Design a protein around this ligand. Structure first.
Ligand code: NI
Length: 341
């Protein structure tokens, strides 16, 4: 049945709760972002209202074929009213169209649901700053001190340098980038831009990317694989057989692949700096696994919470095991003690 941590008390609302059937008491279903663990169960036959960002609404229409009468898109950073309750959508710094949700309850309680997010000090200057938050529903994916990762900017620098050097040395090398959901677009767009190429991809993926309000996107992506020296592939194909196979399909246009798998974390981060990352290589194929995270590091998360000072924290990730839960509660307490709330 729907877990408690997907229900907003004192409203008829749920968040990211589409795989339980009709939830008893729910009048409006919010969707934070277009990732399959969160939308799971939405389809063209869904007949209740769905409240979301404009980009997420483009995706439900065009990718899931949800009928339009049921899609309720809202602007960001704007006070809106849903079934009598003031709400605000905030940029989550996750994937395109991902939002955090502010609920202002009739009784005076204020609730922030982060969805999936990568905390950043820029959030400390939105509409969050203007009033107190009583309850925080927190994206705790990496809520343990071992999880340190570099800035997104440092990771893209590494990728752009590496790609530029490989193709300048061998103009017949192809760059391949793995993907399996929206998000991490800067990886493949930043590399394409340094090489003066478009990114070539499947028709399906191309459609997806046209949903995202990306400025100048027609100048950046294509379905013609021949014209382009950065290709996007299903992540599942980012290995030596999958890449040799793809190289065979290019018909002697290329003689080397450099591939990037943008992974979340990899325990190589507990020993190795970004400058000190190395590929797995076999013959004329090299694969780099790069720690491009769209979730908070442990330190980023801690700073955000110590700044916000919520009265109660409700974890939404890693809640399935008693040892995980108990470990997160002990950190929350350390954070509160350290800061005096
Ligand atoms: Ni996500």
């Amino acid at each position: 049945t729907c877990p408690f941590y997907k229900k907003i008390p004192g409203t008829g609302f749920t968040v990211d709760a589409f795989q339980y059937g009709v939830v008893e008491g729910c009048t409006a279903y919010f969707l934070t972002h277009f990732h399959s663990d969160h939308y799971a169960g939405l389809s063209k036959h869904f007949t209740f209202p769905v409240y979301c960002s404009e980009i997420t609404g483009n995706l439900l229409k065009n990718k899931l074929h949800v009928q339009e009468q049921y899609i309720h898109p809202l602007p960001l950073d704007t006070e809106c009213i849903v079934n009598g309750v003031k709400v605000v959508l905030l940029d989550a710094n996750h994937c395109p169209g991902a939002v955090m949700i502010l609920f202002y309850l009739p009784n005076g309680t204020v609730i922030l649901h982060t969805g999936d997010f990568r905390a950043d000090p820029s959030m400390e200057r939105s509409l969050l700053a203007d009033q107190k938050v009583h309850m925080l529903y927190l994206d705790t994916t990496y809520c343990s001190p071992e999880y340190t990762f570099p800035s997104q900017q440092e990771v893209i620098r590494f990728a752009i340098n590496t790609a530029f050097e490989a193709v300048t040395l061998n103009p017949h090398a192809l760059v391949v980038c793995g993907t399996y959901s929206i998000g991490k677009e800067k990886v493949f767009l930043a590399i394409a831009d340094v090489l003066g190429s478009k990114v070539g991809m499947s028709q399906e993926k191309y459609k997806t990317l046209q949903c995202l309000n990306i400025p100048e996107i027609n100048s950046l992506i294509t379905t013609d694989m021949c014209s382009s020296l950065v290709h996007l592939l299903p992540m599942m194909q980012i290995n030596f057989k999958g890449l040799q196979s793809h190289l065979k399909k290019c018909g002697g246009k290329y003689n080397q692949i450099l591939a990037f798998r943008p992974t979340g974390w990899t325990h190589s981060n507990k020993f190795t700096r970004i400058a000190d990352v190395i590929p797995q290589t076999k013959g004329n194929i090299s694969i780099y696994g790069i720690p491009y995270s769209e979730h908070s590091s442990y330190l980023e998360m801690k700073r955000f919470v110590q700044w916000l000072k919520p009265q109660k924290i409700i974890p939404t990730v890693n809640v399935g095991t008693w040892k995980s839960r108990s470990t997160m509660e002990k950190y929350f307490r350390e954070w509160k003690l350290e800061a005096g709330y």
